[PDB]
Amino acid sequence: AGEIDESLYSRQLYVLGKEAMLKMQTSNVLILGLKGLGVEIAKNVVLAGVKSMTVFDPEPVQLADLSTQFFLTEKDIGQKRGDVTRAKLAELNAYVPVNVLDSLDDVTQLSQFQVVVATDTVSLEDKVKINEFCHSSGIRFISSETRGLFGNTFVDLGDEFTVLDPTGEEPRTGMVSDIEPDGTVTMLDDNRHGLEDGNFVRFSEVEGLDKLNDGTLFKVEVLGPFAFRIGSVKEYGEYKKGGIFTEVKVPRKISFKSLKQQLSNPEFVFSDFAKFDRAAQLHLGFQALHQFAVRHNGELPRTMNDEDANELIKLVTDLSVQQPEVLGEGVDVNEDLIKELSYQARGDIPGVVAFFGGLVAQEVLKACSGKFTPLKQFMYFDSLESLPDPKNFPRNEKTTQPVNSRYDNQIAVFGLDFQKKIANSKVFLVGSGAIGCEMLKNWALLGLGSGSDGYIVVTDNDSIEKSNLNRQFLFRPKDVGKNKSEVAAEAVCAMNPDLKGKINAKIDKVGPETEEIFNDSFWESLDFVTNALDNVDARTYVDRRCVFYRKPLLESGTLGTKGNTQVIIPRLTESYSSSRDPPEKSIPLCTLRSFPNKIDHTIAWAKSLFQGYFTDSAENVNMYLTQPNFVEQTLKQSGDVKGVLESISDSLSSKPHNFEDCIKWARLEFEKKFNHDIKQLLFNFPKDAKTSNGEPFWSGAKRAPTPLEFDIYNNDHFHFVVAGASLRAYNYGIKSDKPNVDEYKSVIDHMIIPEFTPNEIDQLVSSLPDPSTLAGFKLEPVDFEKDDDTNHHIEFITACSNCRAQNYFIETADRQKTKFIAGRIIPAIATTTSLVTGLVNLELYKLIDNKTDIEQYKNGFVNLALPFFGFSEPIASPKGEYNNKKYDKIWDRFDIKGDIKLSDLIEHFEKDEGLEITMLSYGVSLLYASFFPPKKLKERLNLPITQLVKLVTKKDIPAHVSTMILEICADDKEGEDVEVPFITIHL
Amino acid sequence: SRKSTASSLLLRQYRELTDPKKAIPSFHIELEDDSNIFTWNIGVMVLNEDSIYHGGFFKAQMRFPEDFPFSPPQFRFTPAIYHPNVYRDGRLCISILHQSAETWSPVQTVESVLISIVSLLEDPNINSPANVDAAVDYRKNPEQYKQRVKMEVERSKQDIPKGFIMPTSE
Amino acid sequence: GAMQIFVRTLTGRTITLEVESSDTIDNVRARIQDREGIPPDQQRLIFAGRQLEDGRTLADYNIQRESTLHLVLRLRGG
Ligand SMILES: Nc1ncnc2c1ncn2[C@@H]1O[C@H](COP(=O)(O)OP(=O)(O)OP(=O)(O)O)[C@@H](O)[C@H]1O
Ligand SMILES: [Mg+2]
C-alpha cells in the first residue's frame, strides 16, 4: 500500500519518520513465548504497526503466569498461552494481523519472518539453534529474559545491517557568514553550529561557491563552537555572501556476531555504568541458570534455596573456566550476586518486564527499519536496590512460598507481607494518558490498592482521541470520545478483578480550580503520588502540593525515544521544582513580525494571525455587544486600544452575507498580508538599502521579501483562501453547500483588487454601531483544534505560513510539520512509555519500604535510540538557617493555629523565631509591608488573616479551605533580610 | 545557594526600587491595585538632559512569569510611544527580554531591564527596527523625528501622577 | 594531573575536555557553557550513579582518564 494512517500514527511518525514506518509495514515479526515479557514486547510491536505479528506459545496457562501477563485471566487456565492472547493482541491495531504458530517442529518455518524474538520460555540450547538458522539466513534475531529483579537482552541483526539514522534527532542547521578558501566555515555572529567531528553537512545559498550547494556532503572538522572546516573550497570558487549548512546523516553498515560466539566473547552495552562489573557476572549467571535447568529436568533453582544457590555458584565457576574472556584474569565470581540471581530465579516482576518489554520492542523496530542505533550486542540489568530491608520483611523459603495466587512470582522475590503492604497502599495517579495507562497496568499486575486498606485514585479531564490509541493501549476505537480515566479503570479491572471497586476514576483537572475536590483530607490520606503529566505547569502544581503535604512523588516523562524518572522523598531529597530545565525556544519579536528566516517563524506568525482573525476578533465583538462599559474598559485597560477598536469596527463593517463574501474577504486579506504589507516594508527598507557600516540591510538573518502575485494554482494561495473563507463563515454562522478551483477562480477573477499605495481615537469609538442595532447578533469564536482534519485549522495555518514563507524565500512545509510546530505536539511512542513506567515501578518498591537512605533511590535517564540508560542518586534537600536555627529549605514550614491577627502573627515571629516580618503575601497578592504608611498599617495590623485577604483580593476565603500558605520576607536578629520557610495557617 | 521564590524576589526588588533612599529616580514603580506582585505599573523617565526623550513620563506595564527570574518578563508601553524599536501595540524589540547582544539570564533584575530600556530609548537599535515611521524618520527625516518625539514627550506629561515631583535633570 | 574526559549528551553528541583532577564541577560547567551555550543552572551531569554537584572536584567523584560524563535532562511528555 505505502500509505501511513497519519490520524493514528501521528505522534509515532514524529519519532520514527515515514520511511521507517514504510519498512516496518513490510516486516513480519515472530515472538516465541507469551508470558509477561513476550506479551509486553508483542503489545508494543503491534501498536507500532508492523506487517504482521505471529506468536508461538503452546504451553498451558498457569495461574502464576498472570504475575505480568496482563492479557491472561483465570478462565484461561489450562488453555494455550498463544491462543488466548492472539485475539487480545489483534484488538490493539486493526492494521496488524496477529496469527498463532501452532508448532515449531520445523525450523524452516522461520524463513517467512524478518525478525524473530525468543523470550524466557526458550531454552538456551534452542536459542542457539534458532539464532544459527536466523543468522545464516539473514533473519534478524533478538532474545531476552527476566529473572526476578534481573534481566538481559541479546541482539543479533546478522552479518550485514545498515543504520540509516543513528539518533533520530533533528538535523543541525545554521547560517554561514564566511567560507574561507581552506574550507573554514564561520557561523553568523553569536551562533553555534552544534556539530562534532565526523559529522557531514550539505550547503545551500552559498553565493560564490556554486557547486558547493549541489547536495555534495562535506566532512566536518570542528575548530571551535563557532567555526568548522570542510576542506579546501578553491575548486568551487570564492565565497561572496549568504549560505546555510544542513547536517546530513550517512548510512553506517555494521556486523553482528552469532549468539554462540557472543556467549564466549560478549560485547556488552551497560544499563547502569555504576554496576558495570556486574554485566560479566550476570552473563555467566544467566547461562548457569540454563545449565541448572538441564541438570534438574528443566526446573529453575528453588526460591530462596541455599542448596540451589550454592550449585549455581559452582556452575558459574565452571563456566568462567570454559569462558575465560568473560570475567578476565584475576576476577573472582561475585558469589553474593549469583546467590541473589538463584534466589530470585522464579521471580516475575512487572517493572522489570516493562523495562525489557519496551527496550526489546524498540530493538525490534530498529531491526525492521534501520532507524536508531541497535543494541550491540548484550545488555544486563538488575534493580537489587528495590529489595526491602530484610529486618522489616525477611526473605526466606517460608515467606516467599507460593500461596496459589497470581502474585506468587512476585511474592517469590519480595515475600508475602511486602506484597500485602503493596495491596494496602493508597495512591494518587495524576493523568491517564500514555504513562497513565501503562502505570495502571503495572499497578493492576502489582495488585496495588487491592487490599482492604488500599485504593487507587486516578484523575484526568481529557477524552480519548484517535491518535492516543497508538500508545494508550487500554483504549479501543469504540472508546474515542469517552473519558480516559473511566475507560482505563474498567480495562485494568478486567485484567485483575481484585481492583474492582478499588479504583476511583475521576475526570477532574488537577490545579488551583479543583482544590475543593482535592482538598487537605484527600492529599493527607495518600501514601504517595505518581505523576503521568504532559506539561510543566501541572508537574509544578503537583510538586508543590506534595511538598505541602509531605508526600512522596514519583515523577516521569518522555520525548520520543528519550525518558526520565525522578523520585521525590519528603525531608530527604529536593523536589521537582528545585531544578530547572531548558526552556522552550522563543522567537525575538522583531524576527517574528518583520524579519523571519525559518519556517518556525512563519508558523508562529500564522498561528497568531489565525487567533486574531477567528478567535480574538469574535470575542471582542461579543463583549462589545453584551457589556455596557466595554468601550470604557478598553480605553483605560489599555494596551493596544487602536487595535481592538479597529477589530470590532472591521468585524461589524464588511459583514458577510454568504460564503462568496467570505471568499472575497480572504482574497483581499491575501493581497493585504502578502502583497501590500510586503511592498510597504520594502518601501521603507529597499532591497538595496544599506546599514550604518555601508553593509546591505537585507543580509544575514534578514531575507529580502518579495510580494506575492495571487496564483490559484499554487496550493498555498488556494488553501489560504479556502480555509480563511471557511473560518470566517464559521464566525458569522454562514453554513456550507472538497473545494473546486474553478468555482473559487470565477469569484476571484471578477474581483477588483485595489492597487498598493504607500503611506484621533475619538472618531473610531463614534464609528462603531450601536449594540441595540445588533441585538441578538453573536460571533462564534474558533477554538484551536489541531487533531480535526475537517475544521480547516491546520489547513489555514499551513497555507498562511507558507505564503509568508514564499514572501521571504523560506522553504514551505507540509501540514504534518506545521501541525507539529503549531500544535506543540510531543513525539511519543509506546516503547519508551512502557520502559519509563517500568523504572518508576522499580522505584515504587523503595517507597513501600520507607527507605531513608538516599543512596538506594535512583533517578533515571534513558534514550532508547542510542541506546543509553543512566541512573543517579537524588540530590539531597538543601539546608538553611536563620538566627542559627537550621531548617530544610524544601520541606520545613511554620505552622500557625487559627485565623490569627496580623499583629499577633508578627508578634509571635519576633518572640518564637527572632524574625521581624517585613513583607507578607498570599498567592500573588501583597497583604502586609512594614514600609506601608501609618494609615494602611493600622488598618491591616488589626485584621485576621482571612479578612486581610478579603481586604486585598476582594474575594472571601471559601468554606472548604482548611489551610492557607503565606510567604514572608523577614529580618533576623541583626536586622538583615534572610530566607525563611513558608507559613501554614491552620484555620 | 539562596533559592528565593518568585514572589519573594519580586517583593525585595520592589522594596528597593521604591525605598526613599535606594529607589532609582528614573522609574516610578507601583504594583497593580497596590497588591499584585507579578504585574507592575512603571513610569519610565529620561533624566539625561542631552536626550531627546528628556522630560517625558512614559507609562508602562511589566508582567512577570511564575518562574522568575528563570524566564524573562513582559514589557509594554501603555500607551505605545513613538520609537524605532516599539510596535503599535506597546511591545518592543529588546534583546534583554529575549531568552536563548546580551539576552535574558537569571542574573538580570528589574533594574537592569529598565536601565536597558532607557538606553534603547536614547539610542535606538536601527539594525532591528520594530516598525516605521519612527525607524525611517530616524534616518531620512531627523527633524520630523524630533518633532514626533517632542510631541510624544508633552503627550506623556498628562500621565504624571498628582502630587508627584519630577526629579531634577542630570 | 592533567587528563582527558568526555561529556556525552542525551541526544548522543560527544564533547572532549582537557581538565585536571583538581578542577571543580563549577569550572567544568563554565566550560560546557562556553562550548555548548547551556547555562550551568540547566546542566545535569551524572557519572557512575552520582549527579555532579558544585563545590566538589572531579577527583571527588573518582573521575579518571577517558571517563565519560553524561549531560541528561528531564522530558515533559507522557
Ligand atoms: N493538570 C492536569 N490534571 C489532570 N490531568 C492532566 C493535567 N495535565 C495533563 N493531564 C493529562 O495527562 C495526560 C498526558 O498524556 P498524553 O500526552 O500521552 O495524552 P494526550 O495529551 O491526550 O496525547 P497528545 O499529547 O498526543 O495529544 C493527558 O491525558 C492529559 O489530559
Ligand atoms: Mg499530551
Residue numbers in the entry:
A (entry chain A): 11 to 747, 752 to 773, 797 to 1024
B (entry chain C): 3 to 102, 112 to 181
C (entry chain B): -1 to 76
Which lines from the publication concern this structure?
As an E2, Cdc34 is the central player in a cascade of enzymes that includes an E1 ubiquitin activating enzyme, Uba1, and a large family of Skp-Cullin-F-box (SCF) E3 ubiquitin ligases that function in tandem to assemble Lys48-linked Ub chains on proteins to target them for proteasomal degradation. Additionally, Cdc34 contains unique structural features that are crucial for efficient polyUb chain extension through poorly understood mechanisms, including an acidic loop insertion proximal to the active site and a long C-terminal extension.
Globally, the Uba1–Cdc34 complex exhibits a conserved architecture with the IAD and AAD engaging the Ub adenylate, Ub(a), and with Cdc34 sandwiched between the UFD and SCCH of Uba1. Comparison of Uba1Cdc34-bound to Uba1apo reveals a 20° rotation of the UFD proximally (middle) to bring the catalytic cysteines of Uba1 and Cdc34 together for Ub thioester transfer (right). Analysis of the Uba1-Cdc34 structure reveals three networks of contacts at distinct interfaces: Cdc34/UFD, Cdc34/SCCH, and a tripartite interaction between Cdc34, Ub(a), and the Uba1 crossover loop that connects the AAD to the SCCH. At the heart of the Cdc34/UFD interface lies a network of salt bridges between the UFD acidic patch and basic residues of Cdc34. Specifically, Arg14 and Arg17 of Cdc34 helix A (hA) form salt bridges with Asp1014 and Glu1016 on the UFD, as well as a water-mediated hydrogen bond with Asp1008. Introduction of charge reversal mutations at any of these positions on Uba1 or Cdc34 results in a significant loss of thioester transfer activity. On the other side of Cdc34, the helix C/helix D (hC/hD) surface forms an extensive network of contacts with the SCCH around the catalytic cysteines (right). Cdc34 Pro140 inserts into a hydrophobic pocket on Uba1 formed by three phenylalanine residues 605, 695, and 707, mutation of which results in a loss of E1-E2 thioester transfer activity. Interestingly, although Cdc34 contains only the last basic residue in the motif, Arg14, Cdc34 interacts with a larger surface of the acidic patch than both Ubc4 and Ubc15 (middle). This is due to an additional basic residue proximal to Arg14, Arg17, which, facilitated by a distinct hA orientation, leads to extensive contacts between Arg14/Arg17 and the top of the UFD acidic patch that are critical for proper Uba1-Cdc34 thioester transfer in vitro and Cdc34 activity in cells.
